[PDB]
Amino acid sequence: KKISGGSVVEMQGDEMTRIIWELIKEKLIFPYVELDLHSYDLGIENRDATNDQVTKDAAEAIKKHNVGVKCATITPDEKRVEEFKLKQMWKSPNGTIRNILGGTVFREAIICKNIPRLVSGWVKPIIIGHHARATDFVVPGPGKVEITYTPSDGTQKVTYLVHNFEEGGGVAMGMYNQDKSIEDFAHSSFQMALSKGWPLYLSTKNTILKKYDGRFKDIFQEIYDKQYKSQFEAQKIWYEHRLIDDMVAQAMKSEGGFIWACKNVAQGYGSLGMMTSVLVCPDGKTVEAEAAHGTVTRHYRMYQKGQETSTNPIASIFAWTRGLAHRAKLDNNKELAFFANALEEVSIETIEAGFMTKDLAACIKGLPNVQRSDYLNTFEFMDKLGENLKIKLAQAK
Amino acid sequence: KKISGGSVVEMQGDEMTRIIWELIKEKLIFPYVELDLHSYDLGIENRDATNDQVTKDAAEAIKKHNVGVKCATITPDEKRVEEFKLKQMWKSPNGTIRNILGGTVFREAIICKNIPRLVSGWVKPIIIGHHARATDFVVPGPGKVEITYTPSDGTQKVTYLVHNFEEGGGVAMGMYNQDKSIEDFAHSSFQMALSKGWPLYLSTKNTILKKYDGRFKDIFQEIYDKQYKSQFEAQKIWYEHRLIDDMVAQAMKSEGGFIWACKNYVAQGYGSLGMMTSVLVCPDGKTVEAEAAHGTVTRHYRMYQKGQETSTNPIASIFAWTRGLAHRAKLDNNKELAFFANALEEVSIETIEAGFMTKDLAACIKGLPNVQRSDYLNTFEFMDKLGENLKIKLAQAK
Ligand SMILES: NC(=O)c1ccc[n+]([C@@H]2O[C@H](COP(=O)([O-])OP(=O)(O)OC[C@H]3O[C@@H](n4cnc5c(N)ncnc54)[C@H](OP(=O)(O)O)[C@@H]3O)[C@@H](O)[C@H]2O)c1
Numbered sequence A: 001k002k003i004s005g006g007s008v009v010e011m012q013g014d015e016m017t018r019i020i021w022e023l024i025k026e027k028l029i030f031p032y033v034e035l036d037l038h039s040y041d042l043g044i045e046n047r048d049a050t051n052d053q054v055t056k057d058a059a060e061a062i063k064k065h066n067v068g069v070k071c072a073t074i075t076p077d078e079k080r081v082e083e084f085k086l087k088q089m090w091k092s093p094n095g096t097i098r099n100i101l102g103g104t105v106f107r108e109a110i111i112c113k114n115i116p117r118l119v120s121g122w123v124k125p126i127i128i129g130h131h132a133r134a135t136d137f138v139v140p141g142p143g144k145v146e147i148t149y150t151p152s153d154g155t156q157k158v159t160y161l162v163h164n165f166e167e168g169g170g171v172a173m174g175m176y177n178q179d180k181s182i183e184d185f186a187h188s189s190f191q192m193a194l195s196k197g198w199p200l201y202l203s204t205k206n207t208i209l210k211k212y213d214g215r216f217k218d219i220f221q222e223i224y225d226k227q228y229k230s231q232f233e234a235q236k237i238w239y240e241h242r243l244i245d246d247m248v249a250q251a252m253k254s255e256g257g258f259i260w261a262c263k264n265v266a267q268g269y270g271s272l273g274m275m276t277s278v279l280v281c282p283d284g285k286t287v288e289a290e291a292a293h294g295t296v297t298r299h300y301r302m303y304q305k306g307q308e309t310s311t312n313p314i315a316s317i318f319a320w321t322r323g324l325a326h327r328a329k330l331d332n333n334k335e336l337a338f339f340a341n342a343l344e345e346v347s348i349e350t351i352e353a354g355f356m357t358k359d360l361a362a363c364i365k366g367l368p369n370v371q372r373s374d375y376l377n378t379f380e381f382m383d384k385l386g387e388n389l390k391i392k393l394a395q396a397k
Numbered sequence B: 001k002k003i004s005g006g007s008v009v010e011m012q013g014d015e016m017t018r019i020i021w022e023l024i025k026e027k028l029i030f031p032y033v034e035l036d037l038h039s040y041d042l043g044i045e046n047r048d049a050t051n052d053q054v055t056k057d058a059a060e061a062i063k064k065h066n067v068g069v070k071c072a073t074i075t076p077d078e079k080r081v082e083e084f085k086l087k088q089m090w091k092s093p094n095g096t097i098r099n100i101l102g103g104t105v106f107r108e109a110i111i112c113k114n115i116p117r118l119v120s121g122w123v124k125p126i127i128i129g130h131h132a133r134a135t136d137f138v139v140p141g142p143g144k145v146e147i148t149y150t151p152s153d154g155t156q157k158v159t160y161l162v163h164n165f166e167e168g169g170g171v172a173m174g175m176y177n178q179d180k181s182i183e184d185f186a187h188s189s190f191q192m193a194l195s196k197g198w199p200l201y202l203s204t205k206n207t208i209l210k211k212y213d214g215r216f217k218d219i220f221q222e223i224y225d226k227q228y229k230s231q232f233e234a235q236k237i238w239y240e241h242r243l244i245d246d247m248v249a250q251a252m253k254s255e256g257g258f259i260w261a262c263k264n265y266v267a268q269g270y271g272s273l274g275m276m277t278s279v280l281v282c283p284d285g286k287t288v289e290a291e292a293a294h295g296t297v298t299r300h301y302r303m304y305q306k307g308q309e310t311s312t313n314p315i316a317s318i319f320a321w322t323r324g325l326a327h328r329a330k331l332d333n334n335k336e337l338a339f340f341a342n343a344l345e346e347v348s349i350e351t352i353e354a355g356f357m358t359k360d361l362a363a364c365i366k367g368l369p370n371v372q373r374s375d376y377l378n379t380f381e382f383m384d385k386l387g388e389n390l391k392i393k394l395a396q397a398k
């Protein structure tokens, strides 16, 4: 009865999202999709118990199985180590995973019409895929800061004066970017664009950063022309370098519906529970979907105290739908593909139908005016989603 | 009758804003203020004709008279050069003015109670000051790209490795910042905060890019505690640090009304550009260059040329004038001018709040598809309305 979704690496996360994860899996995914589940519990405790080995495993697992849907996970800091008596301040599992899988993250603000956007003109969502450490430092007083490139082939070492501080000090920094990374960024971006049939857009400062950002413009254009150009048009889709400036202006002027590859991480005034991240690996096959938000600690605390919480599961639900959608794509799993979509549709519809969590209700009536009667609580919204998903899916088969 | 405004460096601009600009002068400023006007025509034709000499002169002028009220000017691109048959693709005069003058730009969306702020909370305006270039190269193939510091004295030689390329080459860059620039940014910022009696916040990464943004947080605290914490507290105002992640949130949960000093690598936000004012605040505390944050509003100008009715928001440009005048007034302690500058700012907001507003604003309130010809006034109706309300406001006050 259920549809074999195939193998999917699922990563359990922490706190509120972990609570929602089980609801999403319980109400929205399991009842309709059978999955060869490579479930890894990236719960903060389990990452501790397993010395973060589980994070690396879930990574190698995603590397292996191409599809990773990840629940928000606590990234340990001073407080976390203290709260969980962590044997260590573990690296962000995202960092670990992202470093293992490489790839470019793509945050899509999933948009409901009755939900105010930065630009109410964006009926089509905007997929922003950011690129990526920088070497900043002292400079206490006068002296030359020179950035130096020494070829490994022992040919002439190149020295660029980045600045000669004569008066007082200041601060300097080195940044770099491997062609490889720019290429990955390119492929992940073109890949992502084709994936959603939406036009790609590389925004850089090709002008002020001639050699540097130009390298992106070039590499992108080069990977596009010699790898995706035909593939694009053959979809009405099209890539195009846009100066950060003309690009930000274009977006506001646009109704959205385009992939935006940035080259400079919260920002944005839209609801966090509607922000879906997707680590699109260059290979075009590996993908890791996850809510862009975190474990929603504040909500969890409330949940811990037995208080009514109104956490938005959409970003997590969409992590599932995006991963599953990708699973489907990879496996030509047209039933799973439809389900991923149906679930995305049902999620948006449920919200566009007036049923939402407090945060969304707050996007509409402003926090101060949000009444208990304006939103459903976490469980209530989840149920609603399930009911409609049940409905939506019945309407097909 | 008219109040002695003093010397003000005015820069006529281009297209739609050029129209609104002359309207603002003709209807809002000149009837009430006599300025020793240093008008510079930064119109695209004139800049071309004078080989952008006018732009440098205007900048030179602003530096001399400490006050520039600049109209939006066409920054030439490829289409521009073709269009105006420009002799060259002249730099953004803003750029030129900016290079010449230096200082921190402070953008302020002038707030109207009946116009949706990005955050319904924002009752008072949030004035964002942005800092202010780098040596970037290709890095052919593999090899160590390492940034090196060498004190002039020779005491040390710190060479950090930005990156050791192994998998082919890529692209590296070195960026820097003199404390002067940061200090400047701090003064501009602290003085801006004083000038407008609003707490000053500084936001940085100060974690991921620690050291770099750290020198900012420091040089700010240091300039604050050493030159400003006095004047600040002695005005129910102050300064405080913050992380971009904390500011973006601390802001939402606030009535706005603070000088926000950003430090990134701009300034497009929700609402309307017609309400975006921009002020170049030079560190010296004396030189200022007010201007609409928006451009010449070409789409509106094209319409205007086709004879179509336009509804351009003069508010930004009007506040370019009022802020320029307010600052001229500050420098001369011109009570009257200072009053007018504010009265004009008052009339502009009170008019809009009174329901009389250009289409862009009506578009904010209602939404584009729901805006009717009756929900707004065209460029000129609005200007008249502001004018009439300014006469009223300026008549009743005395
Ligand atoms: N694994 C990841 O991708 C990831 C990413 C970020 C953070 N985290 C972890 O999240 C834990 C807490 O982080 P955080 O609280 O800073 O970030 P967060 O969980 O994103 O919290 C953001 C705040 O935004 C609102 N919010 C965010 N997501 C929401 C949702 N789905 N539904 C309803 N409201 C939502 C809540 O504020 P209101 O109180 O105003 O409702 C929430 O407290 C931290 O340990 C962080 O490490 C994980």
Ligand SMILES: NC(=O)c1ccc[n+]([C@@H]2O[C@H](COP(=O)([O-])OP(=O)(O)OC[C@H]3O[C@@H](n4cnc5c(N)ncnc54)[C@H](OP(=O)(O)O)[C@@H]3O)[C@@H](O)[C@H]2O)c1
Pocket (backbone or CB within 6 Å): A249, B071, B072, B073, B074, B075, B076, B094, B273, B274, B275, B291, B292, B293, B294, B295, B296, B297, B298, B299, B300, B311, B312, B313, B314, B315, B316, B358, B360
């Ligand atoms: N010197 C400056 O200060 C400055 C700054 C920026 C740009 N510019 C020059 O501006 C010229 C055109 O810029 P642009 O095309 O980006 O236009 P703009 O002047 O930047 O504004 C573009 C769009 O913004 C909206 N807008 C801006 N100001 C408005 C106002 N007062 N009232 C109503 N709507 C307003 C309009 O959108 P709607 O189409 O929806 O009405 C306008 O078409 C370019 O040459 C640029 O170089 C000059």
